[PDB]
Design a protein around this ligand. Sequence first.
Ligand SMILES: Nc1nc2c(ncn2[C@@H]2O[C@H](COP(=O)(O)OP(=O)(O)O)[C@@H](O)[C@H]2O)c(=O)[nH]1
Ligand SMILES: Nc1nc2c(ncn2[C@@H]2O[C@H](COP(=O)(O)OP(=O)(O)O)[C@@H](O)[C@H]2O)c(=O)[nH]1
Lengths: 420, 420, 345, 271
Amino acid sequence: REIITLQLGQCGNQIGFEFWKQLCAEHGISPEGIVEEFATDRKDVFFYQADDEHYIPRAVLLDLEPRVIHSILNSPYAKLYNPENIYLGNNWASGFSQGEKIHEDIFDIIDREADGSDSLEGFVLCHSIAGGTGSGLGSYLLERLNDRYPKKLVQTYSVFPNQDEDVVVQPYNSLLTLKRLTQNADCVVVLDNTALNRIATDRLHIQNPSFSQINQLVSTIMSASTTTLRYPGYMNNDLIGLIASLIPTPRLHFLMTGYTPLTTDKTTVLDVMRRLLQPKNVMVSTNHCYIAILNIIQGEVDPTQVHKSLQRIRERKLANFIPWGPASIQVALSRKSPYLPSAHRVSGLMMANHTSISSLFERTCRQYDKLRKREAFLEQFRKEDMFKDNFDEMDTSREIVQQLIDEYHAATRPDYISWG
Amino acid sequence: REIITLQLGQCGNQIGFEFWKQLCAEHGISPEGIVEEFATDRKDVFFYQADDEHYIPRAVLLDLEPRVIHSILNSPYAKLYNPENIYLGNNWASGFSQGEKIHEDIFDIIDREADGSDSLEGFVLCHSIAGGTGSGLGSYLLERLNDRYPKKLVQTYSVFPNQDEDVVVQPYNSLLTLKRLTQNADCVVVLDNTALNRIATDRLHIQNPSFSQINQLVSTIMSASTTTLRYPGYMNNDLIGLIASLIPTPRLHFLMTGYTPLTTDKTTVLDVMRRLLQPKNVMVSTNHCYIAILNIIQGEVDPTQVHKSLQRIRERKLANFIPWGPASIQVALSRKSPYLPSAHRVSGLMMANHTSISSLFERTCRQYDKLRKREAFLEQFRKEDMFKDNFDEMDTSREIVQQLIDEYHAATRPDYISWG
Amino acid sequence: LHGLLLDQHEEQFSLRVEILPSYIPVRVAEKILFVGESVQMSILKNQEDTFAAELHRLKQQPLFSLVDFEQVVDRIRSTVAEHLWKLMVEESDLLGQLKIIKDFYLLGRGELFQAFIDTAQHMLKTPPTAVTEHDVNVAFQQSAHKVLLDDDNLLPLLHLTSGWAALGLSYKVQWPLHILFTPAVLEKYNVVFKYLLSVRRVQAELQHCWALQMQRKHLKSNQTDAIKWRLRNHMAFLVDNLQYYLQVDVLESQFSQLLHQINSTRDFESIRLAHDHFLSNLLAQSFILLKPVFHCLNEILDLCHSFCSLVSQNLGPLDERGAAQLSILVKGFSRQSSLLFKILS
Amino acid sequence: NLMQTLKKDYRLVEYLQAMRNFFLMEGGDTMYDFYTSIFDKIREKETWQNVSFLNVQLQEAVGQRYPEDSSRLSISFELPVHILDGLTLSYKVPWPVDIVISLECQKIYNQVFLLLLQIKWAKYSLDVLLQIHRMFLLRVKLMHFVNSLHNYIMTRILHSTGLEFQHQVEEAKDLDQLIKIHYRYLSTIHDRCLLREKVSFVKEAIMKVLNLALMFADGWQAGLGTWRMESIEKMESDFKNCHMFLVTILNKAVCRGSFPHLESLALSLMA
Ligand SMILES: Nc1nc2c(ncn2[C@@H]2O[C@H](COP(=O)(O)OP(=O)(O)O)[C@@H](O)[C@H]2O)c(=O)[nH]1
Ligand SMILES: Nc1nc2c(ncn2[C@@H]2O[C@H](COP(=O)(O)OP(=O)(O)O)[C@@H](O)[C@H]2O)c(=O)[nH]1
């Protein structure tokens, strides 16, 4: 059914601004939200249908200590997103406390939209981990949503931050976010600043303006992850139908990304699949193995070869997995949109549950464990100490994330049939 | 059945001047009132028809301390309105007292027209609330008319004034007008200066000359509210038949307005009905709900789709109402006139009884309650004190309007069965 | 040439094999009928006499040669058949209406046949067609209204002959403008619609039955092993998720081939072979052609339905003698899944 | 050549539209003037059947350049409510056009005219006006219902069908077809309005629930409080139960009968 995106924090607000803009041009929408003369899609799930064809995204924009929310307002697309729902520290504790006083007005803004929709399916957060204001406020709002909508689900386009390690409290902030994210988020899609920065260095010479260019990379993945839902067809029509295959255990819900034409600016299906399993096409930075893999292709794809193609990759075995699950790589197919360029006539993406992402979680847990002993940055800011005098949520978070680190490696073992 | 518009006060005289001019061009009439050269429309209702070339309309013009009644006289349309019936402070009390000395000659001018016409359905007041001279004189004339014509009914095109809050006594003047209007007016159609000013800012860049441009907006609504009566049709050719559904209870006789192509300068009825139910198209500024809704459409409208169209607005539920009444949205249809432009070939208006208008009444009651305690502007002008030494009509008005504020919220409740 | 019926008395209408002369082969006789039926529904009139001169020429010759007779019948076959294709592909929009048969009939649409089952679930009881019959069509048309998909749509009608057991669909064609779609052919499309509906309905229950991530395990440890359904949800899902990915290639492969072949050839009679092969392959390849395999798959489907039932009522995690039901189900799925190794054989 | 001379010379299109607009099928503003006069209770004879008075009222409301061939004279027929039938109106049409407007068919048009004047009477009966305010609540539960009927009969059935007919007769080119199409259009107007087939099953239900609105305003006159009516609970129960009977009756149509004409108005919004 219709999905409401809670884009929050300066970094999160930057990737929601672009994601909606990306679906503006891709769909038949202008910068004023009006349909255009030039422009068969299920526009409804991602866009509210107004009366005079003003298809307004159901975006919830939360601004805290706003600077980049003012720049979003001075844009040609300011009219495109007008649910008229925008409401006024670098510490996780500093963000969580600020969110608690304004929780009811931000929560009424959630209600208004929920009333507008016929059936609400999911809350998709453009979350920033260790995002200063973005983290802490995002964890708190993550906890409120599940209690109010126990039946409903929450996804997170977490931009997990890896910049080669400025935030001196970055590990502490991230540590707290995951504990909330592991028990209070049904799904999470992981992205990495360094992994994309390495891709940016690979495809282009761009190094210093890494954040502006990488926004486009995060966007192409984000638009792409939903293309099966937005367009018509009997292909995984709903979100939940798709979510089940990618996440096979309540605890392991983190998803890796990849894009066969990183240089998207003919190709047979057999080729676009093999290219993806290679690790340059991946955008994330003891035996290790995938838990279940899925792929979606949008272009001029022949249908008869896919079975021949499904069998060819299996014989190559470019993707090595031995999970407690009996899961298989799955082939899915969609239509590339008209109007926008058809370059790389065939172009694909993959979303997969991989135990390698455990390593990225352990690296921040490693920085934190080292930092915890030193107590170099306890902040001891009165907000930090008064909010957390015991400082035991960090230890509660440390055991919960360690259980997660343990569970992952248990998945690699032959007996995840038994307790993680 | 002919109607006579008792247009009074400078503001009221400005919107009657334009409303008659609007029906001059719309109907087959020229500026002298002589027939248009090009000329199905029945002009008898709004225009005295004689073998005399001038078809003078039944317009009553009252001037107090005149300035703009003089500008109305120096116009090309001075000949068009010649019943030869125009007769010579900013306080509600100041206006009421001036009206009382001249009541009999102004009342004989009412009689002349009543004797002249075959039958008079009602008297239409282009009333101005807190209109300086317009209010007070208008309340007094409202009280005399019902006693003399107990069988006859009075409507009020009240331009309720909201300019973001110059008149320092504006709340006091308005407070008194409503008490008279609640017990001595059969119907009232509410309009708002700010709501229209906001529309003017929306459709156009006009901000500083708000009064001159907004006159056209009030006019389009006014001509439109009567078009079912003006132009012959299978149904709703009598005003009392048209407003019967909207007023479900005598006390709640205030009507909200809206127009689908505010920018009227093809469209199916499924869409036009739907756009009318969005709040930008509305021109007025605890659960809340409409009491009964009605709509009239004038253009190239197909008649088979209306039932499917009726049923689609039923599915969209764009209009949320739960009144003690069992009232339903009602579809009505009329002919757009020839000669004048047919732009927005299909174009509509809606008149509805909504409990939200209670809020606008409470805001002036709020300004007044705050002002009453301070007694900052008791005027204490000898006219004000000598006319009202007790100052208890304001308190009588305060309880009567509070009963109205209470009754409205009572309509929202499940037991308007109990007294509201 | 003229289409006249009963050019003579006995000894639309069709072949009378007993009175065909032996030397005129049964295949040359069939060609005559097609030329004949099409005339009633051309450029044949423009060159009618030229073809009557040749048929006149064959009359003058002294002896009968089949080699000569066919060549005329065949020439006349060439133009009369080319005419039906000449129009149906361009003026009857033959290719464009096919998108309409697949979109609303082979479950090729996502919104119309998914949201319809959500807003019509109540028809699960046996109906006499007294009230539910009107309500399901009412539901279908309402379903489409949620997001546009609102143009014409008068023709599609659902019918009830176990609330979801019978929902056979019927489209109304323009008969002078469509002889390709027949009473017999749309019946076979109907059999597939009912079977392809069964898989779609079961896969909805399982994805919904995935309310463990959504509620029971979300924020609550509850009991693990002591109070779990063994998460057989994952194994039932594969035998039901895999059929959906299979059904995506048997249907989508064929529709690429039927809509590319139709484009190349130029006689309507031939195109009819393409379509009668496009539906003929969809049946056996999808396994709907009745077989032991489809029967095993339907049993798998009924067991799946019952497993949805157990978890549905339990609510807060508990075993109300749930194990006894789970035990029949866990045993049953294993026995039946082994029958799916018949495919491996 | 006939059809085309029977339009320019012995006008058929003007006469056919004359039979509809400002006549039995459509009131216009002309019939609003005529109907309000006969309804008035002041100076009113028990059935107000004075033919010279009724004819005089019609000429005042001719409201056109051509004001001839309309009588309103046929003798009134000699009733749970006043339920006064009669007032029959007959239009005198000449010979070169009589061929398609039959003295037999005039009866079918006359039948629909009566129903249009009772519904207008019932709605006009609840519109003249304006425990003591509990009655004002019942004013809305009744007006909505009768007004919803008048919407369906006047606009859904007789206006929309009257547009397919005005357009279709332009295309036809015959003396017998122009008759067959006109007979089809009257056999449909008289049937979609509930005046044929089952009568005790469907028609009597609307008739009595009309009869209650008529008694309700007939037992009320404007301007006092002491009506001393204890029957407001009996009338509240009557309308509610008789209403439940009406919408179950329209709901009986789902199994058999004219579903399109009914399942359109069966959605009366109930409550
Ligand atoms: N992918 C991406 N990440 C960003 C961008 N800008 C900031 N970030 C991330 O946001 C995090 C810090 O959030 P910050 O911008 O300090 O939030 P603030 O407290 O509102 O300024 C860092 O971990 C960055 O990696 C961007 O343009 N793209
Ligand atoms: N809609 C509208 N309102 C006006 C216009 N001019 C004045 N008013 C209103 O008239 C009210 C004051 O009446 P006023 O002009 O003082 O009457 P006076 O005492 O005769 O001058 C204010 O509430 C204004 O909102 C106009 O052109 N259009």
